[PDB]
Amino acid sequence: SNAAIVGSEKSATGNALLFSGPQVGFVAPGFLYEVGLHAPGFDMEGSGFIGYPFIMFGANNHFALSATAGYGNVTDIFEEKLNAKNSSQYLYKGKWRDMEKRKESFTVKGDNGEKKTVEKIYYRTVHGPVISRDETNKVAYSKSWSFRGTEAQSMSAYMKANWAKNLKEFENAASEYTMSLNWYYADKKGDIAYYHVGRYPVRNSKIDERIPTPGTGEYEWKGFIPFKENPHVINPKNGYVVNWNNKPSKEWVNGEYSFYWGEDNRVQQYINGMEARGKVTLEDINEINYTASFAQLRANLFKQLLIDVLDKNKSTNGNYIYLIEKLEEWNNLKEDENKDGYYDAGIAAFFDEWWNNLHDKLFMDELGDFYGITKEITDHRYGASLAYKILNKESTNYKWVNVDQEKIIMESTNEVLAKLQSEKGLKAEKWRMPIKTMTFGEKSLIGIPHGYGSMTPIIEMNRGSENHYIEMTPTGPSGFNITPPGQIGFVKKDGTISDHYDDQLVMFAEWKFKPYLFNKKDINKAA
Template sequence: MKKKSALAALSLILSTGLVAGVAAPGAVAQEPAAAQVTAEVSEAGKATIKRDSYGVPHVYADTTRDLFYGYGYAVAEDRMFQLEMAKRAVLGTSAEVLGPDYVEIDKRSRASFDPEAIKAQIEALPQEDRDILEGYAAGFNERVGEVMANQEELLPKQFTDYGFEPTTWSGYDVAMIWVGTMANRFSDSAGELSNLQVLQQLTAEYGAEQGQLLFDQLQWTEDPTAPTTVPREDKKHPNKLAVDSPSQLSDLAEVSPELEDNGLASMKQFGGGDWPAVKPEASNLWIVGDKKSKEKGSILLNGPQFSWFNPSYVYGIGLHGAGFDVTGNTPFAHPTILFGTNKDISWGSTAGPLDVNDVYQEQLNPENPHEYRYDGEWRPMDVRTEKIEVAGQEPVEHQVYSTVHGYVTSFDAANNTAYSKKRSWAGTEIQSFMAWIKIMKAQNWEEYLEQAEKVGITINWYYADKEGNIGYVSPGKLPVRAEGHDPRLPAVGDGSMEWEGIRPFSENPKVYNPKQGYIVNWNNQSAAGFNAGSGNWSPVDRVNEIIERLEEKQKFTTDEIWDINEETSFADLNIRYFRPFLEEAVKTLPAKDSLVQDVRLLTEWDGQRRDGDDDGDLDGPQAAIMNTWLPILFETVLKDDLPASVFENYAQGSGLARPANGSKLVYNALLGEDAGVEQSVDFFNGADKQQVLLDTYRQALAQLAAEQGADRSAWSVPAPQHEFSYKNFIGVPQANAEENLTGPDYMNRGTQNDIVSLFGSEASMCTVAPPGQSGFIAPDGTKSEHYADQLQMYADFECKTENLYPQQLEANLESTTVLK
């Protein structure tokens, strides 16, 4: 059903091809538990690397240092340029080799961490833990040395094209890849300043009282009807602010229109979005346990949505020895497997939902803009001067300022204010990293939770085991905020709104073997009460696409769990919320009214946005109708009640990756008194809601007829395509520009997908991580045979069998390397 011809041509251009091992998830060969892994290391070698038919390395070693030495060496074989540029991106040294265009990126990266603090955390680790980082770096450096000694055959072509050489690594560099691509990307969001600017726009136009009512209707703190990963016990959870009074901001709260929010710019650099969706929203997951799997055990499917890149965002790896026996995929070849199994348990993750950061408004000394008011006196800001080397020009000095709360993200000189960001997880970065490494050895839920409690950053963790138990926990350090602190808005930085401690881990959202028999998440709310200041979650949520399918059957096979992935990947994320209102509205029309049949185009639509005939357009007129109707509906209902600059955030209606922002507001307005958020402002202005739906629908049909002709069956919209970007998520090249890949048709699914079945003594895993395992291009331009051999597989919703057992690996062995 995909554009196989285009992808076949792409494969031909890339000179790659599929190899044996493509599978449906339920077709994975399974072996008895007796086939235990042992460290198959040559007596003369540190580690042995065995690669399977897709180039996935399995590393065997006797000691922790040697195991990760082998890991680092294998990564350097496959992804040396990608990892070199990832290191530069997170450390802020991109401009050193790429020039002045990357200075601003480097500034934001350097302001996101304290090098000395990270180094101190590493130094405090026991040697066994440091062996992980140092061994990985040593293995990587071993391969760098080999490459530099034989550049004519081994140096990745991108280094020559960009005009610089690979650098050696330290344990600190290895740790910073994780800090920069996980902690800083997924645990650093804070939308308070953007919220404040919106509130000020609303109050400027409508006055303080009406502006506050509108703000509460746009940015609520709790909707008791929103789906949660920990099932709600009380569907009538009180809908009120999580604070007793509005935020006690001083008169200096006014924000200059020209203020540049460097905190928001940094957050966007690391994966955030535009207001109101400022939190990273990346990944879905569903698990069924013993109650809903047809065989005794568990099935876990994870689709982390990091966006799409070439080389792949994730790296496949197996680690065997020194207490580890794990296989799976992990972002940027972290020395831990984020999506994997040790055959006793499996685990996965999605972006963290907890509010672990606060923005503070600092009052500045009019006589000195680098002094701020705290505890009744002016205090000097701490300052760190960073020297950024720039290719082709003089170095640039950059000052990073901090207050007692954290890094200063913005200065508002016109109002003598600055904004700083306080992280509850500051100082726990390496502790969190090590906990994620150690879950690979966990054998049960208790051992898994033991590591989760050590995690300071916000993240969602999921668990399943061979006995059919399933669990969810949302780690992260949750601050106890001062009375009167509205978490949606900046806190006053004068010392009156300081945190009163950290909530105990026992209060973090978690659930084990829920009655429903499944756990599901698509970046929805974690649990009742955990919303204030961040998520803005509502019943209009893409997770309903998964929930509906899990509720349709009592028991699932592995194949049936995998099939949900395809169905949700093409689901229109808005129609389910408007369908019942359209059905009611059309009942008011005469049976002969032509609009009755036109409305049924949507109400009887299966909601799938596909290009089944490969003509380049989505099938049927429905996608075109939705894309045209929703913006008209949003404009009619919302535009007159919102300032133009605020309405812009709700104007678009396509909602490919998640429901349109405007759908949440209009759905609540349609519900009226039944909405989970109080509708103080009538967005319909007293008009008949059903008539508004019909009138705007007619307008959409008229617009389409004018643009595409009267034949409804011919209405269409182009099928969007995936782009596998040659730049990483920070915006730094990790390949050559010509390595940008386009296709297949857009699927709202994981950057990678993995499915793990654990049925007693049997374990199986199937994964797909396009474009391929290796990003290596030889000096003469020859690409690795595994450069893009998972791209067609991804398009066809297939996956490759992971070799969890030695016998499987030996049967699919491509190469063996012994590291001396």
């Protein structure tokens, strides 16, 4: 999930900007529901997650707001110690404590279209529900939610955010929201704000937040961090706030999810776009969204580490003059602007495999037999922070490579190029891969089938399930947005889909947007 808010000084038009981009997957019916709410003193247009009676991406009369879910630390696992004489008891503060017993029954439509009922029993400790046990030995694990029992209060806090009429009221609502989100805010008067909402527990300083906490009772939470200590900023001097699942602030720590926030994080794509420009506009944000949606993320940091090595050995390998040229020429993204069946930069294909070859030359020897559980760390979806620190000569706790960095970078260059020259061609045009397509499916992130999806193939894009581009002019919110696949998920009994079931896909694929409607005059002209 990405987002961006821009201050008046950093905005070209002078007015504050806001850009939404929640990555909650692509499904039909869509994960989001667009709506327009109006009433005396309340005019808000936007979209929220299906089911929520409040808008999360949009604007009211006074400000635009957006959100990004991420990987904050509101869930701790506790390693309970069990009683050898009674599995249903754990040591907690110098005494054995009986767990809770919860009986549950599930009706199941078995293989024969007739119902089937299964009985299960789940246990709960003081820290929360037990999720796993360990017969080797006398150990069980329970999950502590920092928000348990407060989901309803967070609903009202989000609804209160909708009803807010100024920043103070918006911040008061963010104060009450108990779960781990990032909230974004932009005023009609040019102010922007960012909040890393959620109630975050006060942990024992003597334990390791990356692994389960002992449940003996001497490492328990001690309250919740006051909201004022959460990451946040009101009108930052730099003029803007961007995010794409990264460290909120230098001071903020993550624990189990540290490997999501590293030196190589994809948010740098949005930072690069803001820093390369002066005062920006919505389309500039749209331009950065395009870059982000097609960026070869490894190319942002590693291509320079590659071009250098090749340049220092420019004379020892004739192929390097060409690679250097095609690498400096390539814009670090894999796009299909020419609308043929293939990506436009064959050197990206070389770079793809170069990385894959390079990643294994670092970790295969020591982590090869554990890629099933570690490769998602070392080849992470958002970046390869560790790999970069190794190749960038940065100090690491463990000595991964036993040779020089340039030797490996060339060993990967030569092997991949050798494979590409014999199997495809001598020049980059013959390396272009055919585009990867995606479809709006039937199963959402939560894992349940909620419809019939869509078979329409559209190019794969590292893009939000929805986009809003809102400028808060002195007259009210303004801009454009898109909410694929469509508003209505209804499918008639005979199979006829709603005329508004997929009428927003093509625009989503062709980077076209519909106008964001707010005042009554425009909404009547759209009907």
